[PDB]
């Protein structure tokens, strides 16, 4: 039988690239010709994978995309020169492994929230959220951390609020909200993967100060 | 025989993680017990890879790091309950695949250069350099793009210099350099992987205007 095969997405260099060599024992009693079927082979997407009919070498012809197709299920066939299948079709599972090629994406471009000016420091205000198309199950490529990039106006001073880097919940950090002088605040928030050390994106959070 | 084995670095989840099942046809004649040898198995680093003596499942016991060890070479053994090896040791090559977990780093914290004030626009001044520890052969995780982040001072005007994104060579972009007015310039340069779209780092290029 053939064991599982893995290939990293976004591979660069020259193609095609060798994956594994399929071989039938009957090769010693007859000339055998190899073929593959399945989505990724003879079915759309066609030709992503190919196999040399005489050598039995399975190959990949282009860079892969885990976010497009993360797993291919193919079937190899072995037929003798006489026209008879010398083996029962063998299943081949090709797993596409992940690369951090997607920046997180906030669920909204502008999040809205409000807070009473007398709110004691530590009061939760609102929550922002971002997703990441990468592999959050097997890697850290989609492990998001939230941070506040800027505040406008920066009065009475900067850091009027803060954000929980895990939950995206924004809270009152200090006292001093003054609806009369600074009615609203526009915060630029950031979401970055690799636990905050990777790719990032930003969005806005507009907070209205109530009485 | 065993096909190539690959495993991505920095994997998360519960360990051990299955890789492949090894079996001996000799089991038909007697009970067989499997084991592995090699650096990464019984020899340092000990226990990175283990094998179930009865089922033959080769497993990985911890997250790997391509920048430390990118390839392991082990050997599987198959011994009968009577004490006789029923197969010759089989070589297993385990390839560690890359993840973009290293940001580029400039070869110097501050690069120094000089240029005569009469220099015509388009004159090469100096060069800045950065390296990236990731896989530059199989991925774009180490493909660097250079850019200028800021210019101090921003006089006589902004864009006095420019940098080739591929080579890192800094050139005179516009005319107006005069040491009598502004003798030195401090540029913040940035190097980012994934061809400029990934992880980034910065440094400074100090340029001195001469007569
Ligand atoms: Ca992708
Ligand atoms: Ca990806
Ligand atoms: Ca990501
Ligand atoms: Ca590493
Ligand atoms: Ca890198
Ligand atoms: Ca790496
Ligand atoms: Hg591959
Ligand atoms: Hg693995």
Swiss-Prot record, chains A, B:
Glycans are attached at residues 124, 129, 202. Residues 1-106, 107-211 form the Cadherin domain. Ca(2+) 2 binds at residue 101. It is found in: Cell junction, Adherens junction; Cell membrane; Endosome; Golgi apparatus, trans-Golgi network. Ca(2+) 1 binds at residue 101. It comes from the Eukaryota. Ca(2+) 3 binds at residue 132. Expressed in inner and outer pillar cells of the organ of Corti (at protein level). Expressed in granuloma macrophages (at protein level). Expressed in the epidermal keratinocytes of the skin from birth (at protein level). Expressed in non-neural epithelial tissues. During apoptosis or with calcium influx, cleaved by a membrane-bound metalloproteinase (ADAM10), PS1/gamma-secretase and caspase-3. Processing by the metalloproteinase, induced by calcium influx, causes disruption of cell-cell adhesion and the subsequent release of beta-catenin into the cytoplasm. The residual membrane-tethered cleavage product is rapidly degraded via an intracellular proteolytic pathway. Cleavage by caspase-3 releases the cytoplasmic tail resulting in disintegration of the actin microfilament system. O-glycosylated. O-manosylated by TMTC1, TMTC2, TMTC3 or TMTC4. Cadherins are calcium-dependent cell adhesion proteins. They preferentially interact with themselves in a homophilic manner in connecting cells; cadherins may thus contribute to the sorting of heterogeneous cell types. CDH1 is involved in mechanisms regulating cell-cell adhesions, mobility and proliferation of epithelial cells. Promotes organization of radial actin fiber structure and cellular response to contractile forces, via its interaction with AMOTL2 which facilitates anchoring of radial actin fibers to CDH1 junction complexes at the cell membrane. E-Cad/CTF2 promotes non-amyloidogenic degradation of Abeta precursors. Has a strong inhibitory effect on APP C99 and C83 production. Homodimer; disulfide-linked. Component of an E-cadherin/ catenin adhesion complex composed of at least E-cadherin/CDH1, beta-catenin/CTNNB1 or gamma-catenin/JUP, and potentially alpha-catenin/CTNNA1; the complex is located to adherens junctions. Found in a complex composed of CDH1, RAP1A and PKP3; PKP3 acts as a scaffold protein within the complex, the complex is required for CDH1 localization to mature desmosome cell junctions. Interacts with the TRPV4 and CTNNB1 complex. Interacts with CTNND1. Three calcium ions are usually bound at the interface of each cadherin domain and strengthen the connections, imparting a strong curvature to the full-length ectodomain. This is Cadherin-1. It comes from Mus musculus. The chain holds residues 159 to 369 of 884 of the full protein.
């Amino acid at each position: 039988v053939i064991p599982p095969i893995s290939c990293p997405e976004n591979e660069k260099g020259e193609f095609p690239k060798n994956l594994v060599q399929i071989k039938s024992n009957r090769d010693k009693e007859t000339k055998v010709f190899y073929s593959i079927t399945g989505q990724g082979a003879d079915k759309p997407p066609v030709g992503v994978f190919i196999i040399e009919r005489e050598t039995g070498w399975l190959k990949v012809t282009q860079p892969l995309d885990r976010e497009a197709i993360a797993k291919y299920i193919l079937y190899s066939h072995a037929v003798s020169s006489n026209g008879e299948a010398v083996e029962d079709p063998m299943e081949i599972v090709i797993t596409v492994t992940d690369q951090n090629d997607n920046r997180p994406e906030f669920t909204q471009e502008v999040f809205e929230g409000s807070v009473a000016e007398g709110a004691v420091p530590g009061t939760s205000v609102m929550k922002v959220s971002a997703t990441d198309a990468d592999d959050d199950v097997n890697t850290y490529n989609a492990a998001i951390a939230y941070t506040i990039v800027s505040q406008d106006p920066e009065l009475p001073h900067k850091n009027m609020f803060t954000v929980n880097r895990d939950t995206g919940v924004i809270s009152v950090l200090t006292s001093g909200l003054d609806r009369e002088s600074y009615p609203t605040y526009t915060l630029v928030v950031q979401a970055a993967d690799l636990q905050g050390e990777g790719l990032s994106t930003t969005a806005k959070a507009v907070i209205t100060v109530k009485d």
